[PDB]
């Protein structure tokens, strides 16, 4: 089976910047390759086919080249609408796609504002306690969130959710939710979330006492 591998997995670039993303096939496929653009919640759009040929209507700042095993998609100067996930595709055989390259907007490092929320009394009636830690408006996307209950590091009882880049300021927000049973929540006192991020001089901890 022929495999398509795209690099990098993730590109951060400024508006106006040039970007080149690559697609490598595990065996030669001559020029049987296409590139698609896909935005969240939407269908892919055809950009380039036969490795280097632009689909009609596609702007000239897009170009592609390559044949055999190494292929290139290039945008000579990015505009805001160009930020998206790009897929390459083998046009015959198993018609396999690459794993995709997400192109995100670069901007200055911005530290998160961190907030912690104890569970409501209403939720405690039901038998479950959710503790929520919010990281608001930060860049870059990477952040480490650790939960501590009575100073013990928690593992396997939290889930994170991250927003797409804000269309104006290009920042991220992140929620981490710690889920405990009512009995478990009520046998401990100190609840803390500790946030590590490139924008902070040192890890920030927000906490409360039950």
């Amino acid at each position: 089976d022929i495999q398509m591998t795209q690099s990098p997995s993730f590109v951060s670039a400024s508006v106006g910047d040039r970007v080149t993303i690559t697609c490598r096939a595990s065996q030669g496929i001559s020029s049987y390759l296409a590139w698609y653009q896909q935005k969240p919640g939407k269908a892919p759009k055809l950009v380039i086919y036969a490795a280097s040929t632009l689909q009609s209507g596609v702007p000239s700042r897009f170009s592609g080249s390559g044949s055999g095993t190494e292929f290139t998609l290039t945008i000579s100067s990015l505009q805001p609408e160009d930020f998206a996930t790009y897929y390459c595709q083998h046009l015959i055989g198993l018609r396999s796609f690459g794993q995709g390259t997400k192109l995100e907007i670069k901007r200055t490092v911005a530290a998160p504002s961190v907030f912690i929320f104890p569970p409501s009394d209403e939720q405690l009636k039901s038998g479950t306690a959710s503790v929520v830690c919010l990281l608001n408006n930060f860049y870059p996307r990477e952040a480490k969130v650790q939960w501590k209950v009575d100073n013990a590091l928690q593992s396997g009882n939290s889930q994170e959710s991250v927003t797409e880049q804000d269309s104006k300021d290009s920042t991220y927000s992140l929620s981490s939710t710690l889920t405990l049973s009512k009995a478990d929540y009520e046998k401990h006192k100190v609840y803390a979330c500790e946030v590590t991020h490139q924008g902070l001089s040192s890890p920030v901890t927000k906490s409360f006492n039950r």
Partner: protein
């Protein structure tokens, strides 16, 4: 210009049959291949198969025994059938046109159908307040929100003060909990000074269970 429109049931239980249909408007089925492509949550596009003449389908080998693709030529429509679905068949399913060599890419595309396979029963969300507090006043800015928990299936909509409050609002993507139910939070950052003089209500709607919740969020 040409539009591909899709319809068909997207909420399925294990072992049932996925049955989707793609309508083509602005063009005939003639002289072209018509294809289905799917995309699991957070994963890459996967070709399922395509057909030009009834009786000559071409399928992705790992799906051949479960997949039927067929043309309804009198209506210029084509359909996808996928039997004995499991949770692993959960994905957005796209239909697309594929033209004759040497012009082989997929174009145009349907808008996609979200398909969820689960044994989970339909359930309305519980809405809990994320109350603002003085140990959440980040330099004159407070944060507050609503926790929208244990619902199925997607989606829920969330607004604040009936759509009047829009600035500083972040409604996170739903996450699938280990219970098989979705959960979500919506938050907003407001001036602290406004906490004692301004009302904040999150409006939550879950149509699959006809659930409408207004929950006022007060400080503590």
């Amino acid at each position: 210009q040409v539009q591909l429109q899709q319809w068909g049931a997207g909420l399925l239980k294990p072992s049932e049959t996925l049955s989707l249909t793609c309508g083509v408007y602005g063009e005939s089925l003639s002289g072209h291949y018509w294809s289905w492509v799917r995309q699991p949550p957070g994963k890459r596009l996967e070709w399922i198969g395509e057909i030009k003449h009834n009786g000559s389908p071409n399928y992705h080998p790992s799906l051949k025994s479960r997949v039927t693709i067929s043309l309804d030529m009198s209506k210029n429509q084509f359909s996808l059938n996928l039997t004995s679905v499991t949770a692993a068949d959960t994905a957005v399913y796209f239909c697309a046109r594929r033209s004759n060599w040497p012009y082989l890419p997929f174009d145009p595309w349907g808008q996609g159908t979200l398909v969820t396979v689960s044994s989970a029963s339909t359930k309305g969300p519980s809405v809990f307040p994320l109350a603002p507090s003085s140990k959440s006043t980040s330099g004159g800015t407070a944060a507050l929100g609503c926790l929208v928990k244990d619902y199925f299936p997607e989606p829920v909509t969330v607004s604040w003060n009936s759509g009047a409050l829009t600035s500083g609002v972040h409604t996170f993507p739903a996450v699938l909990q280990s219970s098989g139910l979705y959960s979500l939070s919506s938050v907003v950052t407001v001036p602290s000074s406004s906490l004692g003089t301004q009302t904040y209500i999150c409006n939550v709607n879950h149509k699959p269970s006809n659930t409408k919740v207004d929950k006022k969020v007060e400080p503590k």
